[PDB]
């Protein structure tokens, strides 16, 4: 069982992967976010957020309005399944979530919720496989 994933966010506003597989024997799953490159958090902060595919838009829209000091997410947003904090370069964060939070016949999206980042394709698929 592969129950973690190491994902990178760079200075060019991209993740180094577009698709996560969550093995369904996993009781928990861990995302290790890191930020290579040379740019601070207020310039090019990244976070990793999980929601259903349907919820992504609203989570992003409400998140952008909440701002950088709220880590670009609406506080307590119930559409947020799991999330990291906002990180700048040279920084890192992990999240671990329960796999029982995912369901068959739902589609899941991961993304960064920093202003306009997900619109520029900092996002990808999350699949129970």
Q: Which is nearer to Cu ion, 42 or 100 (CB)?
A: 42
Token pair belonging to 52: 């259903």
Q: How far is the CB of 29 from Cu ion (least distance, A)?
A: 21
User: Would you tell me which residues interact with Cu ion (CB under 5 A)?
Assistant: 46, 112, 114, 117, 122
Least distance between Cu ion and beta carbon 1 (Å): 29
Q: In this structure, which long-range contacts are made by residues 59-65, counting pairs with CB atoms below 8 Å and at least 24 apart in sequence?
A: 59/113, 60/111, 60/113, 60/118, 60/119, 63/113, 64/113, 64/115, 64/116
SS3 at position 104 = coil
Task: Tell me whether residue 98 or residue 119 sits nearer to Cu ion (CB atom).
Answer: 119
- Is there a binding annotation on residue 122? yes
* Comparison of 8 and 26: residue with beta carbon closer to Cu ion: 8
25, two tokens? 């024997």
CA distance 100 to 112: 23
Shortest reach from residue 129's CB to Cu ion, in Å:
25
Binding annotation: 46, 122
Annotated binding site for Cu cation: 46, 122
């Amino acid at each position: 069982a592969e129950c973690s994933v190491d994902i990178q966010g760079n200075d060019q506003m991209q993740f180094n992967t577009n698709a996560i597989t969550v093995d369904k024997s996993c009781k928990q799953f861990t995302v290790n976010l890191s930020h290579p490159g040379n740019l601070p958090k207020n310039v090019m902060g990244h976070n990793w957020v999980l929601s259903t595919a349907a919820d992504m838009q609203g989570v992003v829209t409400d998140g952008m309005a909440s701002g950088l000091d709220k880590d670009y997410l609406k506080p307590d947003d119930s559409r947020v399944i799991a999330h990291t904090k906002l990180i700048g370069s040279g920084e890192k964060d992990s999240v671990t979530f329960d796999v029982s939070k995912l369901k068959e016949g739902e589609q899941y999206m991961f993304f960064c919720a920093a202003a306009a980042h997900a619109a520029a394709a900092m996002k990808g698929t999350l699949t129970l496989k």
